[PDB]
């Protein structure tokens, strides 16, 4: 006979881009129980109550199955209760349901019952921790001195997993405690996949996403038995090792300095009143060549208490009206659906349809009606250009005061949203976290909604989606999954960050369906937004004190997207600052610029 047993190892750890740890495996001293196939329930009760002399059990919360187990532990009682009923394993379960768990146990009794439950829970030949009230150093060394009196019992060392205080703590996630073994919701997934029931696993964010990587490789043994089933031999099969480590793409120092910037700007805008009803401000920076996440920062402003709190996860979980940043995706949809040809000229004019208020741009009537190319539409943030484009996806040509036919409305809204999805606006980003919001995208809508969607006043998107969108433009239409993890690494001698096992490779999701020369038109528009010399140029704030050439688009909402350097992009950034009523200066582009300059300082680009 041979019975094989699996024990757990140490979890791999999480490091920022410069090698600073984000978590900690901390060593404790613990009462351990190693169970033998030969211990009766009575042998367990004798061990539990010898142990109670040495430990403290103050908070005893017994489940009725635990109470029925302890009760049945008496051999005679177990017989008598089966005798009294209407496959041994089936009869245990049957006898179990038969006893009224309103038995009478003194409070001291309850404590041995608690201890028993702990011992009983341990598999044959397995080793599990016996939870007790914390043990000081002397209490421990008395147990160490008489533990030989108690079969199976010994002192040894275990782990707690701790998250260090850092600006990336929210994103690290948590791990299940030794006490609360596996999560019960997924209990079946994990036993199946291979795990034991007391395993410590990732339950949120990175710890969960990279659980397969972080989980220690287990020691495995086979115990050899004599003809009676008595342990004879301990033959090992696999020796265990610490889990592997992941190194993030984010540098703490960079992330810290973005957090400070957002906090600096948001308080200023509260200072002058512009941010009074704003829910907060969010920024995500990405490397457009690889999808690497440079930082994901968020500051939440509570509209009831006024309090400000860090909200990095807001970047992947909360949604916002995106405003005018999205105008390049609408033009793209115009090219895809045969509405627009190259850098086509349209008339900028108010758009007047039967049944709705006339549509204007930020400049209203100030320059009358005038011709405008696709580049200039982006430069000026023309609503006329994109509203005429959308009507054209619906198969129609604009004439003032037209009654609009809606037979092609669903078809049209689908084509628009499909292009938007090509840029990650309204679709999954691919980011390496368990659960991202994919936006607020209403399945019920009318014609006015379709039209407003075209200039970014209908569907709501997350800040991560808005970064992937500008990064896609910056990477010439090849949209890349954002990834917070940079590589998986081995452990070194001492157990810290060792050497590269495997880098996380760049992942292409799709290629936007527009020609190379169309994409060059978008690039010229974003460039003129920040370099133009018209009274209608919207984005010169991008270039004001810019240390590299910046291209971008401006966004009630003060949103902004940008990349740099223009000629060879190494950073793409989205800034989302909702319901800022400041009409005298727009801080969106200035935040975007200052994040770009911060990065250039930190990782020179040129
Ligand atoms: Zn034997
Ligand atoms: Zn809003
Ligand atoms: Zn730096």
Q: The domain spanning residue 184 has which CATH number?
A: 3.90.1310.10
Q: Which residues pair with 33 in a beta bridge?
A: 128, 153
Residue 192 CA to residue 38 CA, distance in Å, equals 27
Phi, psi of 346 (to 5 degrees): -130, 170
**Segments in 84-232 forming alpha helices (H):** 88-97, 107-120, 137-146, 169-172, 187-193, 205-209, 211-214
Classified as helix, coil or strand, 162 is strand
Decide if 415 contacts 337 (C-beta within 8 A): yes
**Judgement on whether residues 117 and 253 belong to the same structural domain of the protein:** no
Q: How far is the CA of 594 from the centre of ligand 3 (A)?
A: 13
Question: Which of these, 520, 519, 564, 504, lies nearest to 539 by C-alpha position?
Answer: 564
Q: How far is the CA of 319 from the centre of ligand 3 (A)?
A: 30
**Judgement on whether residues 163 and 309 belong to the same structural domain of the protein:** no
Question: Which of these, 11, 15, 32, lies nearest to 177 by C-alpha position?
Answer: 11
Tell me which ligand sits closest to the C-alpha of residue 600.
3
Which residue among 505, 537, 558 closes a domain?
505
**Segments in 282-382 forming alpha helices (H):** 314-317, 327-336, 374-380
CA quadruple 229, 233, 239, 242: dihedral sign: positive
Name the one residue in this structure whose structure tokens are 């060394």. 141
Non-local CB neighbours of 366 within 8 Å, separated by 6+ positions: none
Classified as helix, coil or strand, 71 is helix
Enter the tokens of residue 177: 């405690």
Residue 182 CA to residue 197 CA, distance in Å, equals 6
Residue 105 CA to residue 201 CA, distance in Å, equals 36
Tell me which ligand sits closest to the C-alpha of residue 598.
3
Decide if 348 contacts 361 (C-beta within 8 A): yes
Non-local CB neighbours of 110 within 8 Å, separated by 6+ positions: 60, 62
What is the domain range of residue 109? 35-124
Decide if 392 contacts 404 (C-beta within 8 A): no
Phi, psi of 321 (to 5 degrees): -65, 130
Q: For the chain, how long is the longest CA-to-CA vector? A: 100
Number of Cβ atoms within 10 Å of the Cβ of 56: 12
Classified as helix, coil or strand, 416 is helix
Name the one residue in this structure whose structure tokens are 């990405």. 286
Residue 531 CA to residue 534 CA, distance in Å, equals 10
Non-local CB neighbours of 509 within 8 Å, separated by 6+ positions: 430, 479, 480, 481
**Judgement on whether residues 222 and 86 belong to the same structural domain of the protein:** no
Look at the chain and report how many structural domains it folds into: 4
Tell me which ligand sits closest to the C-alpha of residue 38.
1
Residue 590 CA to residue 525 CA, distance in Å, equals 19
Tell me which ligand sits closest to the C-alpha of residue 318.
2
**Judgement on whether residues 360 and 501 belong to the same structural domain of the protein:** no
Number of Cβ atoms within 10 Å of the Cβ of 601: 12
Residue 36 CA to residue 373 CA, distance in Å, equals 82
Q: How far is the CA of 169 from the centre of ligand 3 (A)?
A: 19
> What is the CA angle 279-280-284, rounded to 5?
135
Non-local CB neighbours of 399 within 8 Å, separated by 6+ positions: none
Residue 116 CA to residue 49 CA, distance in Å, equals 8
What is the tally of helices (H) and strands (E) in the chain?
Answer: 20, 20
**Judgement on whether residues 231 and 167 belong to the same structural domain of the protein:** no
Long-range contacts of 488-493 (CB under 8 A, 24+ apart): 488/213, 488/244, 488/245, 488/246, 489/15, 489/244, 489/245, 489/246, 489/247, 490/244, 490/245, 491/12, 491/241, 491/242, 491/244, 491/245
Q: How far is the CA of 282 from the centre of ligand 2 (A)?
A: 13
Residue 189 CA to residue 186 CA, distance in Å, equals 5
**Judgement on whether residues 253 and 282 belong to the same structural domain of the protein:** yes
Name the one residue in this structure whose structure tokens are 């030949």. 125
Q: What is the dihedral angle through the alpha carbons of 130, 133, 139, 143, rounded to the nearest 10 degrees? A: -20
Q: Which residues of 255-288 are buried (b: 16+ CB within 10 A; e: fewer)?
A: bebbbebbeebbeebeeeebbeebbbbbbbbbbb
Cis peptide before 565 (omega within 30 of 0): yes
Residue 478 CA to residue 476 CA, distance in Å, equals 6
Enter the tokens of residue 552: 């971008």
Q: How far is the CA of 314 from the centre of ligand 2 (A)?
A: 14
Radius of gyration of the chain (CA): 32
Residue 255 CA to residue 258 CA, distance in Å, equals 5
Task: For residue 293, give the CATH number of its domain.
Answer: 3.40.710.10
Number of Cβ atoms within 10 Å of the Cβ of 236: 10
**Judgement on whether residues 81 and 228 belong to the same structural domain of the protein:** no
Q: How many residues does the chain have?
A: 606
Tell me which ligand sits closest to the C-alpha of residue 597.
3
Q: How far is the CA of 235 from the centre of ligand 1 (A)?
A: 18
Decide if 379 contacts 521 (C-beta within 8 A): no
Which residue among 505, 538, 554 closes a domain?
505
CA distances to 54, 111, 198, 537 from 51, rounded to whole Å, are 5, 10, 22, 79
Supply the DSSP string of 135-166, one letter for each residue.
--HHHHHHHHHHGGGSTTEEEEEEEEEEE-SS
Q: What is the dihedral angle through the alpha carbons of 317, 321, 327, 329, rounded to the nearest 10 degrees? A: 30
**Judgement on whether residues 66 and 208 belong to the same structural domain of the protein:** no
Residues with CB under 5 A from ligand 1 (ion): 226, 228, 230
Decide if 295 contacts 284 (C-beta within 8 A): yes
Q: What are the DSSP E strand ranges found in 469-518?
A: 478-480, 485-491, 497-503, 508-511
Q: At what angle do helices 327-336 and 383-393 cross, to 10 degrees?
A: 30
Decide if 266 contacts 283 (C-beta within 8 A): no
Q: Which residues of 433-460 are buried (b: 16+ CB within 10 A; e: fewer)?
A: beebbbbebeeebebebbbbbbbbbbbb
Question: Which of these, 241, 128, 138, lies nearest to 495 by C-alpha position?
Answer: 241
Number of Cβ atoms within 10 Å of the Cβ of 502: 11
**Judgement on whether residues 204 and 79 belong to the same structural domain of the protein:** no
Classified as helix, coil or strand, 125 is coil
428 CB-contact burial (10 Å; exposed 0-12 / middle 13-18 / buried 19+): middle
Question: Annotated catalytic sites, by residue?
Answer: 324
Q: Is 426 left (phi over 0), alpha (psi -120 to 50) or beta?
A: left
Q: Which residues of 298-321 are buried (b: 16+ CB within 10 A; e: fewer)?
A: bbbbeeeeeebebbbbbbbbbbbb
Experimental method for this entry? X-ray
Breaks (C-N over 2.5 A) in the chain follow: 86, 555
Number of Cβ atoms within 10 Å of the Cβ of 498: 15
Supply the DSSP string of 313-333, one letter for each residue.
THHHH--B--GGGGHHHHHHH
Q: How far is the CA of 43 from the centre of ligand 1 (A)?
A: 18
Q: Which residues pair with 461 in a beta bridge?
A: 320
**Judgement on whether residues 372 and 317 belong to the same structural domain of the protein:** yes
How far is residue 475 CA from its own chain's centroid? 24
Number of Cβ atoms within 10 Å of the Cβ of 41: 16
Q: How far is the CA of 37 from the centre of ligand 1 (A)?
A: 12
Residue 166 CA to residue 168 CA, distance in Å, equals 5
Residue 270 CA to residue 505 CA, distance in Å, equals 42
Q: Which residues of 557-574 are buried (b: 16+ CB within 10 A; e: fewer)?
A: bbbbbbbbbbeebbbbbb
CA distances to 260, 295, 598 from 253, rounded to whole Å, are 11, 10, 11
Decide if 2 contacts 220 (C-beta within 8 A): no
Residue 369 CA to residue 207 CA, distance in Å, equals 57
State the distance between the two ends of the chain, measured CA to CA, in whole angstroms. Answer: 70
Decide if 606 contacts 548 (C-beta within 8 A): yes
Number of Cβ atoms within 10 Å of the Cβ of 462: 29
Decide if 32 contacts 155 (C-beta within 8 A): yes
Task: For residue 120, give the CATH number of its domain.
Answer: 1.10.10.1230
Name the one residue in this structure whose structure tokens are 């709705």. 356
**Judgement on whether residues 226 and 210 belong to the same structural domain of the protein:** no
Enter the tokens of residue 42: 């009575």
Task: For residue 231, give the CATH number of its domain.
Answer: 6.20.70.10
Phi, psi of 307 (to 5 degrees): -65, 150
Supply the DSSP string of 417-437, one letter for each residue.
HHHHHHTTTTS----SSS---
Question: Which of these, 207, 114, 213, 112, lies nearest to 168 by C-alpha position?
Answer: 207
Q: How do the residues of the chain divide into helix, strand and coil, expressed in percent and rounded to 5?
A: 35, 20, 45
**Judgement on whether residues 496 and 395 belong to the same structural domain of the protein:** no
Q: How far is the CA of 72 from the centre of ligand 1 (A)?
A: 27
Residue 36 CA to residue 229 CA, distance in Å, equals 10
Q: What are the DSSP E strand ranges found in 164-269?
A: 220-225, 231-238, 245-248
* Specified resolution (Å): 2.2
Which residue among 473, 505, 537 closes a domain?
505
Number of Cβ atoms within 10 Å of the Cβ of 60: 16
Q: At what angle do helices 587-602 and 252-272 cross, to 10 degrees?
A: 160
Residue 495 CA to residue 13 CA, distance in Å, equals 10
Classified as helix, coil or strand, 4 is strand
Classified as helix, coil or strand, 104 is coil
Question: Which of these, 288, 291, 262, 292, lies nearest to 275 by C-alpha position?
Answer: 262
CA quadruple 453, 290, 528, 258: dihedral sign: positive
Residue 481 CA to residue 508 CA, distance in Å, equals 7
């Amino acid at each position: 006979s041979q019975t094989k047993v699996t024990t757990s190892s140490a979890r791999g750890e999480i490091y920022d881009a410069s090698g600073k740890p984000l978590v900690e495996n901390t060593l404790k001293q613990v009462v351990s129980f190693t169970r033998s196939n030969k211990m009766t329930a009575t042998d367990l009760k004798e061990i539990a109550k010898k142990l109670l002399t040495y430990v403290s059990i103050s908070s005893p919360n017994l489940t009725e199955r635990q109470l029925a187990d302890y009760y049945l532990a008496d051999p005679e009682i177990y017989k008598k209760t089966v005798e009294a009923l209407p496959e041994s394993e089936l009869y245990n379960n049957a006898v179990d349901s038969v006893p009224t768990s309103q038995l009478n146990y003194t409070e001291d009794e309850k404590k041995e019952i608690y201890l028993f439950s702990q011992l009983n829970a341990v598999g044959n030949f397995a080793t599990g921790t016996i939870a007790t009230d914390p043990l000081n150093d002397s209490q421990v060394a008395v147990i160490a001195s008489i533990s030989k009196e108690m079969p199976g019992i010994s002192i040894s060392t275990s782990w707690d997993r701790k998250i260090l205080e850092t600006s990336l703590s929210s994103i690290v996630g948590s791990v299940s405690s030794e006490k609360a073994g596996l999560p019960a919701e997924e209990a079946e997934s994990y036993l199946k996949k291979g795990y034991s029931l007391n395993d410590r696993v990732g339950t949120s964010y990175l710890e969960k996403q990279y659980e397969e990587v972080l989980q220690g490789k287990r020691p495995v043994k086979e115990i050899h038995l004599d003809k009676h089933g008595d342990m004879e031999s301990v033959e090992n099969i696999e020796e265990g090792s610490k889990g592997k480590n992941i190194k993030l793409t984010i540098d703490l120092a960079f992330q810290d300095s973005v957090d400070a910037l957002l906090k600096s700007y948001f308080n200023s805008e509260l200072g002058n009143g512009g941010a009074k009803y704003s829910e907060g401000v969010y920024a995500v920076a990405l490397n457009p060549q690889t999808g690497a996440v440079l930082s994901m920062s968020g500051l939440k402003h509570d509209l009831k208490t006024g309090e400000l709190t860090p909200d990095s996860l807001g970047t992947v979980t909360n949604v916002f009206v995106p405003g005018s940043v999205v105008k390049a995706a609408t033009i793209s949809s115009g090219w895809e659906n045969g509405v627009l040809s190259g850098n086509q000229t349209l008339t900028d004019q108010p758009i007047v349809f039967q049944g709705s208020a006339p549509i204007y741009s930020w400049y209203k009537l100030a320059y009358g009606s005038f011709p405008i190319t696709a580049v200039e539409a982006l430069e000026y943030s023309s609503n006329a250009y994109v509203v005429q484009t959308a009507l054209g996806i619906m198969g129609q040509t604009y004439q003032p005061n037209m009654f609009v036919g809606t037979s092609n409305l669903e078809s049209a809204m689908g084509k628009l949203r499909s292009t938007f999805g090509e840029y990650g606006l309204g679709s999954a980003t691919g980011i390496d976290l368990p659960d991202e919001s994919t936006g607020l995208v209403p399945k019920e809508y009318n014609f006015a909604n379709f039209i407003t969607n075209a200039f970014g006043q209908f569907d709501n998107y997350t800040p991560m989606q808005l970064a992937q969108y500008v990064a896609t433009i910056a990477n010439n239409g090849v949209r890349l999954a954002p990834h917070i993890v940079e590589g998986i690494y081995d452990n070194n001698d001492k157990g810290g960050l060792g050497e590269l096992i495997q880098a996380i490779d760049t992942k292409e999701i799709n290629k936007v369906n527009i020609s190379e020369s169309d994409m060059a038109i978008l690039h010229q528009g974003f460039y003129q937004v920040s370099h133009g010399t018209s009274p209608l140029t919207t984005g010169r704030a991008f270039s004001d004190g810019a240390t590299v050439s910046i291209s971008g688009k401006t966004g009630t909402n003060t949103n902004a997207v940008a990349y740099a350097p223009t000629e060879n992009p190494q950073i793409a950034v989205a800034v989302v600052f909702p319901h800022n009523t400041n009409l005298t200066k727009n801080v969106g582009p200035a935040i975007a610029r200052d994040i770009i300059n911060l990065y250039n300082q930190h990782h020179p680009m040129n």
